TrEMBL record, chain C:
Belongs to the AccD/PCCB family. It comes from the Bacteria. This is Propionyl-CoA carboxylase, beta subunit. Residues 1-154 form the CoA carboxyltransferase C-terminal domain. The chain holds residues 354 to 529 of 529 of the full protein.
């Protein structure tokens, strides 16, 4: 049973999601609500339209990092409906170290804003953060992808007409004061929310003044005197009601960029994916078995079905949305790459979003393959992926290794979203491949130096290498660092993709245009 | 003598630059040239037009990182003239671990391409790299700002008409094979340069074939059979001659975006900056003393000279180029920020590039200041910095701390270039400020717990904090991680800025447009 | 106004001017430049603007509240409205103190009653008509449906004096 293993991995994932979703420990959660605040996840839930789906981004950020003191990186990010509008929601988890920004907290905040920009989605910031994690301040503060970029993003998104709305529900200090101050419209809760560029300790240190947080930057002060805020709320629930009313004033949406059909169900249950895909990425299988199950009516029109057969390219629909599926089905050849590049051209001209299903060991190796120009054929595909103007989605269903990652729309090629299955692996090369290649070089060196090794010693050398790639390449390590937007149950692939395509449908497409194709 | 200290810091900087410029140790350098190759820095030098200036980016990347096994991150990046055209040049330093990509090597490669994109400069890649640093493969391979982004950049820049030209002078393997394969035009040196997606060890491991690098992907093979390359060169010198000829076919440049005047010299020697600026950022001085020395004719028209006097805003010229200088002259107030925002609006409408001279402790603190809306006044300035369509340059001449960094166009606000003086510091807050604030909180906690500390103990607690900020905040730590594009001799400020403005003058400007200004 | 402009919400100005606050501290706090920021916003807004004068319309307040020179799509007045550069008593106080340095004030107080009257205003097309206050809602609803089909310009402002 492949399926027993898949079901085990999904049960593990769901336990990690439930734990991370609680945020801080029970003491922290109790303190937070002791004075009348709603919990962060309750805040998100009350903001949403009843029945709205919520596409959560990076829920297991910082997993196994910082000694696990920041579950989910102490911040909740996702997309959901507020007064009928799809909005990106960013909520500081005050139960996790007072909503402190660890390096991954910043990265996760920035990732949410990137999604907002690319899909033209309004941004709602539910602010409750005690500041930066000072021991790692060098990884939080100074660089292009650090805390400052949050405000570059707010301002440039606001200039493009993407609403930036903030609700200050707790602490907001130092540079974090710019979240509400650089919002288009800001709510603050009375006798609870505070905003200041310089907090009480710094006021005391600098001037000797003793001042409370309330006196320094409370809701009444900013809503009546300073004008830093625009709405004064009675409590968290009132603040969220007010945000919903603000969202109801948002202007017209762009029209859908392609024609959406009525959804047709697949012929098979999605749980059958567990039976069809080997958890071990080294074990071969027919990727058609995945495609046939996730697409509407289990129908698809395969392009070049009999050519370059280790890559599967097919037109289909998911939840009424047209899609061009590019799915690995073995080692990549020149023909596979030529086929992928062509297929991508068609989707680009026809305004068909691309779905990349990655399970990619790499390219065929050897003199005849390099002599046949496999590097330049691969290059054409990468050019097409990079330059395509249609939205792209990527799901790693198996391996994601080496140059194949690039050719199949990895994170560096700006797919709108990238997810991973629980069995997936990602690394510069496959674990076994790495061990085997490094042993080949080390074995040759030892021979040349006159100290050739035994079978046991070669094996002892490979074991730590295999451990490195297993440790650095598993989905939890990947998702903790936001190389992906989340680990998904394989049976949710269809749902998630359908939801994402709905989100991607309202950002205007650029013109078609490619870099030079190396013929 | 402030100047004795400045001169000492510059002598230290120049020794570090000379050492890093040698690349690998003498053994490595000898091996490299033993079979007829030119050294990396010789390659760059022969590529340039005789007499051309070379603006080198990030020469001290990876300083004090990786146990200093990768000086300059094993890669040379900068801008210079090739056949009359300003080009970004990226050269792998094969004398430094065979041109291996450490994490900072990738970042430095990407930084060069960012500069190429923003200023519409052709890219010339002199390839000679043995691959990735495998123990840190997780920081080299998978994410949006990792190795894959190099090829996303090549392709998207090529689509915009920014020439991508490659010369393969040594090894080129795995994903690195895409450098030449995704170039518009590629040169390779016979019986020296090699290109393959899969190298000999992997060929052997996978298939058992024994094949030499030459047999697998040599210059003759790619230039006669595969078509991966377009020119076959006799040696390094010939390859560089060929690149120069390619560069001579580049199409028309965009016109200058503003009117350039005849340069007028300043009234004072630039070395006088050493006498005028205290090395210690805490020591007050008049920033007018800097402005008067770096600008043409020592002339400037100060905007709002008598208002918000802790920020200096003046119109001037540097090497005939118009500039709007925004220079800190104390702690920021509401009035300073309002003034900066206004000044930026004017430069934006008048197409005047902005020059930010950072020496910023922070904002004034206290109830009256927060009540006067200092957060929202700061916000307006950040909005203006972020949204400005004119090129921006930043030089940190003193402190760069906290929210003031953001308001004064730090790295997250995409100035075309950002440099640092040898005396500069950068951190989420000033070292002394941090120690003082953290001691204030810790002292209060100890008191409240009934274990108040002595003066000696408070001091013992501050010492490691001061050491943290001195260690993480000095220019060598900053420049090693590419938070800046280099540490400059203060006396070169005028030259460097004049050179950069010349580079920024030919990228088309966007329209004026701001995010919401929080009035 | 920046918010309405970006969200594409038409503006409706209901004028009842009572001047700006006057005094050393108010001028020192920059009331002139703050008023100016609003005028810039009104003048440059790309969304349709409508103006209804429901009370007074006097001096600089007229400009900040989208008077006739700010090209609202339509401008109406209620029958109780008054419009002039300043009040009648004010104007007479000013012209008298220059003359000195009551029978002189009489024709001037009369002038301002005369010229500030809503019928004097409509006669000259300073406004598009005097309306029943009870018809405000339907007139505005009608106007907004007319304005809904002219393409909007891009957002763009003059320099804001910070």
């Amino acid at each position: 049973s492949f399926a027993d293993e898949h079901r085990r991995l999904v049960a593990e994932l769901n336990n990690k999601l439930a734990a991370a979703a609680l945020g801080g420990n029970e003491r922290a959660r109790k303190r937070h609500v002791s004075r009348g605040k709603l919990l962060p996840r309750e805040r998100v839930d009350r903001l949403l339209d009843p029945g709205s789906p919520f596409l959560e981004l990076a829920p297991l950020a910082a997993g196994g990092m910082y000694g696990d003191e920041s579950p989910g990186a102490g911040i909740i990010t996702g997309i959901g409906r507020v007064s009928g509008r799809q909005c990106v929601i960013v909520a500081n988890d005050a139960t996790v170290k007072g909503g402190t920004y660890y390096p991954m907290t910043v990265k996760k905040h920035l990732r949410a804003q990137e999604v907002a920009l690319q899909n033209m989605l309004p941004c709602i910031y539910l602010v409750d953060s005690g500041g930066a994690f000072l021991p790692r301040q060098d990884e939080v503060f100074p660089d292009r992808e650090h805390f400052g970029r949050i405000f570059y993003n707010q301002a440039t998104m606001s200039a493009k007409g993407i609403p930036q709305v903030a609700a200050v529900l707790g602490s907001c200090t130092a540079g974090g004061a710019y979240v509400p101050a650089m919002s288009d419209e800001a709510v603050i809760v009375r006798e609870q929310g505070t905003i200041f560029l310089g907090g009480p300790p710094l006021v005391k240190a600098a001037t000797g003044e003793i001042v409370s947080a309330e006196e320094l930057g409370g809701g009444d002060l900013h809503s009546r005197t300073s004008g830093v805020t625009d709405h004064l709320a009675d409590d968290d629930e009132d603040a969220l009601r007010i945000v919903r009313a603000i969202a109801d004033t948002f202007g017209p949406c762009e029209p859908a960029q392609w024609d959406v059909r009525r959804s047709v169900e697949p012929k098979y249950p999605q749980a059958e994916l567990y039976d069809v895909v080997p958890p071990d990425p080294r074990v071969p299988y027919d990727v058609h078995e995945v495609v046939v199950r996730i697409v509407d009516g289990s129908e698809f029109s395969e392009f070049k079905a009999k050519y370059g057969k280790t890559l599967v390219t097919a037109f289909a629909r998911v939840h009424g949305h047209p899609v061009g599926i590019v799915a690995n089905n073995g080692v990549l050849f020149s023909e596979s790459a030529l086929k992928g590049a062509h297929f991508i051209e068609l989707c680009d001209k026809r305004k068909i979003p691309l779905l990349f299903l990655q399970n990619i060991a790499g390219f065929m190796v050897g003199r005849d393959y390099e002599a046949g120009g496999i590097a330049k054929h691969g290059a054409k595909m990468v050019t097409a992926v990079a330059c395509a103007r249609v939205p792209k989605l990527t799901v790693v269903i198996g391996g994601s290794y080496g140059a194949g990652n690039y050719s199949m729309c990895g994170r560096a090629y700006s797919p709108r979203f990238l997810w991973m299955w629980p069995n997936a692996r990602i690394s510069v090369m496959g674990g076994e491949q790495a061990a085997s290649v490094l042993a080949t070089v080390r074995g040759e060196q030892l021979s040349a130096a006159g100290t050739p090794w035994s079978p046991d010693e070669e094996e002892a050398f490979k074991a730590p290498i295999r451990a490195q790639y297993e440790d650095q390449g598993n989905p939890y390590y990947s998702t903790a660092r936001l190389w992906d937007d989340g680990i998904i149950d394989p049976a949710d692939t269809r749902t998630v993709v359908g939801l994402a395509l709905s989100l991607c449908a309202h950002a205007p497409l650029d013109q078609v245009g490619y870099g030079v194709f190396r013929m």
